[PDB]
Structure 1
């Protein structure tokens, strides 16, 4: 019954430590990919990544950060940004049963997982491991480490679904409002960046390895010469709020979440089926009387993945193909954080009336012909935008965000 709107946002990414820096990188088509000595020293073939250029030292209370892994740190910082940007203060969101938090990561924390095991196998055993590994390594790290410090009393858990993680978190936050269970739910996610996790994707042959010489060119979605995605880290958080509650406090509304699709391929364990994406996007558009002006694709810069989604988009729109661009060409694939970060990039485009350019397309892919793939920053009054997230295991999420009518 209730309607859900976004009244605040926060982000820590490879292209910016806040919405202002991110906004700048987007309009400039700036890349956040750099060379990683860490990735190379570990023995990996991929030597590039989208790291967060930020010294988080002292940004979080000692007693709070002690239980956190990088995924939680990034998300926590993003939640602080979202809270302020939303105009909310402790007395309104803390110790409030009507306020919740749904945020997760794609891989929890392989770094502290490996750290624990390594320390344990040392001569110090349990003493070397320390009593803080559990909250850093568990899959619910991102929600646990934020809900406690921020005095959250409402819902509190993490949803995980690979590349769609933070997208489902947002969707589930919407469901909480529609059900009348919560007035506000902070939704988002975070993902650390480390060789410990990245080597898993490399050994799987999913990471780019032919552009370690030119980092900024590795992520080239839709480019006939693409050879895998560039792994990234970071966080993002949005304030999902019930409409009347937002209007009552004079909140600043970025947009309304008019659509939320969640489906499953039930086909391949690693590659997309397309059939699932089609149903997902259509589910998100069901009921929306306005057309999609911009579509922030999943496009991770992979041979099959890129083309599969485009084929799914054709099936859904046909001759009504909206503007399309893969921001991952700039940011990289932050995995669990991608969902909320990309949703934010879309909100920034909707809020500032512009479309981010799909960079590094030196030679468009034949199977991408007949579509409107924007490769240059173009100014335009967007009204309804769409964001897709398709992760391993055939899990699909689609969000449709539209401006509010005055």
Structure 2
């Protein structure tokens, strides 16, 4: 029975990470902010909020907007998730030391929730106003949801496959799972993986608001996202994109890269319960966690830390507490980063996987913000108030998505 622990799968390490967030464009600065209790969530100052008088008037825009780094041709030839992909792909490579790798052993797996959807609406308006010849010859390649992964693949020269798993809010973690499978199956030795997502805009706010999923605590934006708290009232948008570089331990050693963590195993399951509510019992979600432990070669008692999906809906957080119990991981120290960074949909599982790596690298879990009144249906060890220090040696990052998708990633200290 192959596991990582028993040498049945090659050892896979994380050797570089990059992310842009509502706190900082610099992941090390985001991480210092989080440990200091900073939130990226503010009053939205966009004119679209007053134009439409939106019920939701809070969110975290990126600290450093993607397009301040894009030249004239990038703005007219890529959709926004493609520009974010290019920006992060170059940062990651530079952070990695700009390695010269074998392109034929180099894969890219990048998830996103939707793709270049603004170009859909642009092409629709252009054609309605001026006919079919007003549609750009670039529209197809900007719009297609594999667009961002493909821009990264072209940019960095990856020829062992470029893949885009889409599973709504779990896409960013699912991508890192498929990258790990591609390596252990022997299709690649090195992979860039993670997730990108669009910015906060009026139409996405309108659509999730009609699901009654979003916090409307507009008077205290930094207090609004309260995962696992008794007084939680839904999620808050917080923009992000994140990528990491993973490679076999052999490949990293040959080029002198210092690992940040190990990526030990991944589990994907599905609920077959409901399209937009997680099964309350957490059973299939718990089993995604268990399967990541089986592939890693770990037991539940090994898991020191869980990085919760923790969206701060009443229903979502209760199902996830039940899933953590099913997996036997409810004595782990838990963090819910959406408390501070909000929800970035297709990117967020990637961002939170990067945070999980940093917890293992640095031996610390940031405080979950706004965690003030424990909820008795949630009987979890939620880290709050101040950071929790410790010699953490194994952690699980959870992500789930509309459609019933459950993804868990098992990481270890290097």
SS of the residue corresponding to residue 191 of structure 1 reads coil
**CA 1:58–1:44: 2 relative to 1, 3 Å:** closer
1:235 Cα offset (Å): 0.8
Matching residue within 298, 301, 310 for 2:309: 298
1:147 Cα offset (Å): 1.6
Matching residue within 325, 340, 346 for 1:330: 340
Q: Report the TM-score, using the length of structure 1 for normalisation.
A: 0.93
SS of the residue corresponding to residue 269 of structure 2 reads strand
> Which residue matches 2:354?
344
Distance 1:203 1:129 in 2: 31
Distance 2:133 2:40 in 1: 39
1:63 Cα offset (Å): 4.1
Q: How does 1:83-102 map to 2 (within 5 A)?
A: 83-89=93-99, 91-92=100-101, 96-102=103-109
1:58 Cα offset (Å): 5.5
1:10 Cα offset (Å): 0.7
Are the counterparts in 1 of residues 172 and 194 from structure 2 also a CA contact under 8 Å?
yes
Deviations 1:39-78 (A, max 9, x none): 4433432111121121434624544453322222223222
Distance 2:391 2:228 in 1: 25
Task: Count how many residue pairs are aligned between Structure 1 and Structure 2.
Answer: 397
Distance 2:334 2:166 in 1: 26
> Which residue matches 2:405?
395
> Which residue matches 1:284?
292
Deviations 1:121-146 (A, max 9, x none): 22x33454433332332211211222
**CA 1:231–1:312: 2 relative to 1, 3 Å:** same
Deviations 1:62-107 (A, max 9, x none): 4445332222222322222221222233x436xx111111102112
> Which residue matches 2:395?
385
**CA 1:183–1:366: 2 relative to 1, 3 Å:** same
SS of the residue corresponding to residue 81 of structure 2 reads helix
> Quick check: 1:190 aligned with 2:200?
no
Q: Report the TM-score, using the length of structure 2 for normalisation.
A: 0.91
Distance 1:83 1:52 in 2: 21
> Quick check: 1:167 aligned with 2:173?
yes
Are the counterparts in 1 of residues 89 and 156 from structure 2 also a CA contact under 8 Å?
no
> Which residue matches 2:21?
13
Deviations 1:323-348 (A, max 9, x none): 00100010111011011100011111
Distance 2:404 2:96 in 1: 34
Structure 1 stretches lacking a partner, 5+ long: none
SS of the residue corresponding to residue 196 of structure 2 reads strand
> Quick check: 1:116 aligned with 2:126?
no
Distance 2:287 2:388 in 1: 30
Distance 1:168 1:39 in 2: 32
> Which residue matches 2:364?
354
Structure 2 stretches lacking a partner, 5+ long: 1-8
SS of the residue corresponding to residue 24 of structure 1 reads helix
> Quick check: 1:217 aligned with 2:223?
yes
